[PDB]
């Protein structure tokens, strides 16, 4: 009560480990710049692992940077580039390594970053097939090279 | 209560809690002839603790 | 020799593969892939596509 003060908690440290990929299928990627529009620290808040797909400003004043894609933008699902998959400091540098061509489970993608934490998306799932995806097991396939 | 003797003042006693992954999973069935598929994610917490 | 499978889409057997059926829509839509080695099937129910 007032001489003797219990236990308390100071620092919450949760660790998680890394969005797995397959061994034998090959990953491809290249670096990209930022956009500066979207709230990156509102994507990179939680210690659990994510990966979000990419689109990319094709022409404009910021053509050639990157940003994470909407599901309503028609342009933004025709201009998909890859996922970013092990997370970033968003400000110690702009610049992101985005992957182009890897696997990723069926529950590392979240496209929503206000949506639960390590399940399968939903309205990705649903619309695959035009944003170039392929699931055969979990597994997302894709190759955004080709 | 056995007695103890220090020459200081306040007592803090500071635990560090730990909670390791646990080695969880069953190794995936598969068949002879096939790439294999990867493991999931697992996560390991640290608090810690004054009084 | 080889031959061509199929995965179900949906249904109660969603998820096996049959061999592809050139006739039929889906066999040809759900091609999923063709099998090499050779396999037995009163000894396992699961070939390496």
Sequence with gaps: ???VKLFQTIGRVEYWERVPRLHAYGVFAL???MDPDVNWAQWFTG?????????????????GHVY?????????????????????DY??????????KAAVPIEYVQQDPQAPALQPHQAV?????????????????????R | FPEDSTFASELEL??????????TG????????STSLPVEARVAKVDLAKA
């Design chain 1, 1 to 3: 009560m007032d001489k």
């Design chain 1, 31 to 33: 670096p990209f710049p």
């Design chain 1, 47 to 63: 210690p659990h692992p994510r990966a979000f797909l990419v689109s990319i400003h094709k022409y404009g004043p910021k053509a």
């Design chain 1, 68 to 88: 994470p894609t909407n599901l309503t933008d028609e342009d933004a699902l025709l201009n998909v580039i890859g996922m970013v998959l092990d997370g970033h």
């Design chain 1, 91 to 100: 400000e110690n540098d702009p610049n992101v390594t985005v992957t182009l």
């Design chain 1, 125 to 145: 799932l649903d619309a695959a097939e035009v944003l170039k995806l392929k699931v055969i097991k979990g597994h997302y396939f894709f190759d955004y090279t």
């Design chain 2, 14 to 23: 500071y635990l560090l809690r730990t909670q390791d992954a646990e080695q």
């Design chain 2, 26 to 33: 069953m190794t995936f069935v598969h068949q002879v002839g």
